């Protein structure tokens, strides 16, 4: 006989609650996508008109958007649980808050199995952390049994906070362990739920014997077979067959990101669990597919309760932050310290291997720094009304893995039309810069000095050209914004971080009071 | 018909709860000073034999221990209470935690009034916490009536937190009101109690018509009568006799500080409420006078309680704090960027008129930094017992105001004998120096830049000569200490502020993790080792 299962998955759906533009940004209105109101829909109908449906999701629900800020997860158990998510893999994200924000809210509400098999507690965490994660879950669809294992990237203690009690294993050796034991228990259909990244995910298909799916994210994959449907453009077919050392294909799917897409799969397996054929094309969530009323009614709820909290005072400024075009587009502004100040602080992790921190050093483009903030307004109170002013575009800060060499010309580029008005000009935290701008274009820069990082005490030193150093950045560079070609991240050299305006409220928050300055990060030297 | 008035009075006790040494720090010898107990017995030997007593306090019991630091004024509450104050004026330090943390634990529990008639409140926050505070009192006191009216000095906004919604007057504008007042209400004796310093207690006694007596503080001010009994030099007689515009004496009394000494004034009134002898002298609380078993009881168990704030977690380094000598005593050490950062963040107030602070600069010289914190000691885990070894010493960072020339006097002298390993070498925030120790000792300084304060967003700009600027820098160096004789602090140029391991430990807590880096706030010029 066979057995036909349609398995749809989210990942990295980073806090998309509400419907976005194309862009996964602020909808205006008029042609909008995903949502959980949305998705709600389209699970729906999928679950009417088709047998065996798994739903899933491969992490990094987690961090985003304000949902995140002000309900903490909650948004994420609420909506898991109101659209019956059959399971979850954690990402990276889900550690943002520390183990205590993991586990209060998410941990101890959801209503399915929170998977990964490569987390391992140690400590006092160890006794129930081990009861609210499992490595895997057999789960009854039809009158079959599937087997599901997650994983979790080892890249979380630098890109999240996990703390000191959790090590992240190899996720080949210990998927392998887990696929032997389902095997051995009388499960023939096994799927990997995971979130490390299409090259691990392909790995996995490889190298892990009896695998027979893998449900990928953290890499933000598009996938589809044939032309696509709106400006994501894939990287392979969809499902992407990995041939395992076994000669079996192994499906590999991921669902792009931010809810924009529902994946959809299905997978026709014989009755001894192989696969027989495996097709399928993410959803887009696009305008045809009407928002679910009764989720969209939840929405409008929470979201006047995340107006009210936009609202609220965080802070003070005793300073005028200095974000105008005037200031931030030609000379040092003191609002792009305070930010990339407020960058690094987000950053600070367990510190490996002869580090006092994997980074030290941040950079913002002064086009990305959109409005002042007046101290004098009203009494220097910081909500996040303002700090959305300053930051309106609802994008992260990421870490790019760069040599010296494209730093400084990196550095090239933030001078070379200085004086146009446009955004180029970089404000920094970590690095010391001089510029001649009496230079031909493209060598102005003069010198550029970065903390160590590999000291015991941060000092500045001479960047080496062929060294290669982290440097975090807004998603725009990252993307190659204003012109930054030479930013551009992929999977082998850029991460995803944490919402703009999330870190500079936590760092507003955490001071109390702030007052940046100037303080000589750039010196424009007056040449010969 | 005359009328005997004995006025027992503190000020400036600043938080020694405990008995202290000669010089008000811990007590680890055999001679041990003050403490509430000790200050228990005097009391109330005084009130059992004198018939008419009053307990006074003229402000500053807030700030100056870690008891302060963990009781947060209930320290305060309780021991003034148990030992039955009669009023109290409140001081700058007063309001440390601002308006909330001077309403609670303070203004909601005392038993008695607290006094200040020159406060003005402007927002309703402000206005009902006033509300607890009054001009003055009409005391009962025997069969007779006595006046107090409270005061508090005017740079209170500046040293301390009250906010931008309580404003201080002229003490002299404000007590005459509240004199005519009590006059016309038929009270013909009248105390002013009050904390703005010893120069303006004189003015008080000279222009407000009616004043019979100031009890002051602020200053720290110590006056005897005849040869003193411990170390502290006294500046004049006790009572100081202050000739008044209408040609009498009127007695003014301060009682120095930290609770070493119990004010002890015997004032003689006629039957129009006249002063006609006033005599006394400050009562050395030493050895000779036994601390109160309950007193000395309830000291002890909170010594207990106070073990859990100094074991606690205040906050983490994940960089070593390089508090060595070879780096603070030579070149830029990050631990002293950390101390000067941490002493700015404590002075922050509000933009007032043209500046965004009324000070933006620290120094801190090295040999006041006696050890480093080693982030791999117990991962990097700071509580107060890796702080006292910072920061041994109790003392304070004071704000001092200094002309440019001074200033840059100041960093000459940091680098006159650099190389030597003694303790002089200059830490700072808010300061860019670069030295040249190749030219001759004295003429090393090649330039000095400040963040302006005259503006709306701080940046660096070149030090004047001719003009004045603040700068906050240790108890030890206002004292002319490592030979800057120049730092030195009189009450024209300097005010004492909060207890530096407080400062520290409240910057760490805020910031949670700490990772101070040298930045260059110091260069040497590129031609010695
Ligand atoms: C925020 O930053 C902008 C950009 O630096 C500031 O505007 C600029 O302020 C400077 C002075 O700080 C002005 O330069 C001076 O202009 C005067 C003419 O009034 C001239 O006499 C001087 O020689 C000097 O060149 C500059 O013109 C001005 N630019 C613009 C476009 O307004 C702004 O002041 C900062 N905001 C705050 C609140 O500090
Ligand atoms: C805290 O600060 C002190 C003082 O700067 C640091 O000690 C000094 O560290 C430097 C750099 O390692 C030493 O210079 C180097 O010494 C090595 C070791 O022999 C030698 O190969 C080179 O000739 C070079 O000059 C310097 O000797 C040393 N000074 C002393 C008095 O020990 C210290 O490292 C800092 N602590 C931490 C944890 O960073
Ligand atoms: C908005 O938040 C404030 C402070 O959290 C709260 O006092 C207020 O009631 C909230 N508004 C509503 C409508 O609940
Ligand atoms: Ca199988
Ligand atoms: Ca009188
Ligand atoms: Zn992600
Ligand atoms: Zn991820
Ligand atoms: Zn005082
Ligand atoms: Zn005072």
Redesign the interface.
Same mark, same amino acid.
């Given at each position: 006989g066979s057995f036909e299962l349609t398995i749809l998955h989210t990942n990295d759906v980073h806090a998309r609650l509400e419907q976005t533009s194309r862009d996964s940004g602020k909808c205006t209105g008029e042609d909008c996508y995903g949502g959980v109101a949305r998705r709600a829909t389209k699970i729906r109908q999928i679950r009417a008109s088709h047998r065996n449906v798994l739903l899933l999701d491969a992490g990094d629900q987690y961090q985003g958007t304000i949902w995140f800020n002000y309900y903490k997860g909650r948004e994420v158990v609420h909506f898991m649980n109101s659209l019956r998510y059959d399971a979850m893999a954690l990402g990276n994200h889900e550690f943002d808050n520390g183990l205590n924000g993991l586990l209060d809210p998410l941990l101890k509400n959801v209503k399915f199995p929170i998977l990964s098999a490569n987390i391992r507690p140690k400590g006092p965490i160890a006794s129930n952390i081990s009861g609210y994660i499992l490595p895997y879950k057999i789960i009854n669809v039809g009158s079959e049994k599937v087997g599901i294992i997650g994983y979790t990237t080892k890249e979380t203690p630098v890109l999240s906070n996990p703390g000191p009690y959790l090590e992240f294993r190899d996720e080949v050796e210990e998927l392998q362990k887990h696929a032997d034991k389902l095997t051995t228990l009388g499960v023939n259909k096994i799927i990997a739920l995971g979130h490390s990244g299409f090259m691990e995910d392909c790995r996995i298909a490889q190298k892990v014997k009896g695998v027979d799916v893998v449900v990928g994210g953290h890499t933000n994959t598009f996938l589809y077979t044939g032309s696509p449907p709106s400006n994501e453009v894939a990287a392979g077919n969809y499902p992407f067959m990995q041939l395992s050392d076994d000669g079996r294909q192994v499906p590999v799917v991921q669902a792009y990101a931010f809810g924009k897409y529902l994946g959809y799969l299905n997978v026709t397996f014989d009755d001894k669990g192989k696969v027989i054929k495996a097709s399928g094309n993410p959803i887009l969530l696009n305008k045809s597919i009407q928002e679910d009323p009764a989720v969209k009614a939840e929405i409008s709820r929470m979201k006047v309760q995340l107006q009210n909290y936009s609202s609220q005072e965080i802070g003070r400024t005793? !300073? %005028?932050l &200095?974000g105008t075009t005037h200031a931030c587009r030609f000379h040092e502004c &003191?609002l792009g310290n305070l930010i990339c100040d407020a960058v690094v %602080?987000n950053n600070?992790r367990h510190?490996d291997d002869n580090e006092? &921190?994997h980074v030290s050093m941040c950079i913002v483009n002064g086009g990305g720094i959109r409005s002042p903030i007046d101290?004098?307004a009203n &009494?220097?109170i910081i909500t996040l009304e303002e700090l959305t002013a300053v930051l309106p575009f609802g994008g992260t800060f990421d870490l790019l893995q760069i040599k010296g060499s494209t730093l400084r010309q990196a550095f090239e580029h933030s001078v070379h039309r200085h004086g146009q008005g446009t955004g180029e000009l970089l404000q920094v935290s970590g690095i @010391?810069v001089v510029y001649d701008l009496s230079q031909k274009p493209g060598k102005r820069v003069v010198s550029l000095n970065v903390?160590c990082t590999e000291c /015991? !005490?941060?000092? %500045?030193v001479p960047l080496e050209m062929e060294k290669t150093y982290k440097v975090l950045l807004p998603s725009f560079l990252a993307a190659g914004g204003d012109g930054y070609y030479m930013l551009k991240g992929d999977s082998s050299n850029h991460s995803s971080g944490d919402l703009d305006i999330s870190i500079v409220g936590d760092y507003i928050k /955490?001071?109390? @009071?702030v007052?940046?300055?100037?303080?000589?990060r750039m010196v424009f030297s007056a040449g010969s």
């Amino acid at each position: 006989g066979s057995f036909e299962l349609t398995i749809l998955h989210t990942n990295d759906v980073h806090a998309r609650l509400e419907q976005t533009s194309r862009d996964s940004g602020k909808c205006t209105g008029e042609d909008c996508y995903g949502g959980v109101a949305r998705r709600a829909t389209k699970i729906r109908q999928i679950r009417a008109s088709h047998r065996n449906v798994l739903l899933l999701d491969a992490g990094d629900q987690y961090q985003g958007t304000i949902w995140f800020n002000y309900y903490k997860g909650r948004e994420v158990v609420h909506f898991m649980n109101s659209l019956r998510y059959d399971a979850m893999a954690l990402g990276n994200h889900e550690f943002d808050n520390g183990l205590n924000g993991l586990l209060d809210p998410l941990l101890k509400n959801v209503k399915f199995p929170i998977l990964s098999a490569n987390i391992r507690p140690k400590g006092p965490i160890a006794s129930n952390i081990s009861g609210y994660i499992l490595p895997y879950k057999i789960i009854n669809v039809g009158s079959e049994k599937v087997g599901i294992i997650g994983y979790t990237t080892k890249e979380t203690p630098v890109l999240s906070n996990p703390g000191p009690y959790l090590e992240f294993r190899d996720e080949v050796e210990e998927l392998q362990k887990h696929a032997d034991k389902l095997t051995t228990l009388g499960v023939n259909k096994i799927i990997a739920l995971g979130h490390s990244g299409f090259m691990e995910d392909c790995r996995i298909a490889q190298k892990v014997k009896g695998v027979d799916v893998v449900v990928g994210g953290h890499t933000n994959t598009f996938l589809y077979t044939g032309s696509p449907p709106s400006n994501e453009v894939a990287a392979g077919n969809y499902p992407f067959m990995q041939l395992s050392d076994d000669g079996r294909q192994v499906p590999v799917v991921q669902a792009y990101a931010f809810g924009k897409y529902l994946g959809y799969l299905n997978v026709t397996f014989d009755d001894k669990g192989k696969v027989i054929k495996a097709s399928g094309n993410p959803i887009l969530l696009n305008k045809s597919i009407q928002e679910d009323p009764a989720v969209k009614a939840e929405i409008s709820r929470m979201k006047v309760q995340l107006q009210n909290y936009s609202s609220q005072e965080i802070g003070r400024t005793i !300073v %005028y932050l &200095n974000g105008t075009t005037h200031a931030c587009r030609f000379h040092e502004c &003191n609002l792009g310290n305070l930010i990339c100040d407020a960058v690094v %602080y987000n950053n600070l992790r367990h510190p490996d291997d002869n580090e006092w &921190n994997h980074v030290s050093m941040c950079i913002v483009n002064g086009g990305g720094i959109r409005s002042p903030i007046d101290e004098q307004a009203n &009494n220097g109170i910081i909500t996040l009304e303002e700090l959305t002013a300053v930051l309106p575009f609802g994008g992260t800060f990421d870490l790019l893995q760069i040599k010296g060499s494209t730093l400084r010309q990196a550095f090239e580029h933030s001078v070379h039309r200085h004086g146009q008005g446009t955004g180029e000009l970089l404000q920094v935290s970590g690095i @010391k810069v001089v510029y001649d701008l009496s230079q031909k274009p493209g060598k102005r820069v003069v010198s550029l000095n970065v903390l160590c990082t590999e000291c /015991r !005490v941060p000092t %500045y030193v001479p960047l080496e050209m062929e060294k290669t150093y982290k440097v975090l950045l807004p998603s725009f560079l990252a993307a190659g914004g204003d012109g930054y070609y030479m930013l551009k991240g992929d999977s082998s050299n850029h991460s995803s971080g944490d919402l703009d305006i999330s870190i500079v409220g936590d760092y507003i928050k /955490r001071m109390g @009071k702030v007052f940046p300055a100037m303080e000589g990060r750039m010196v424009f030297s007056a040449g010969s």
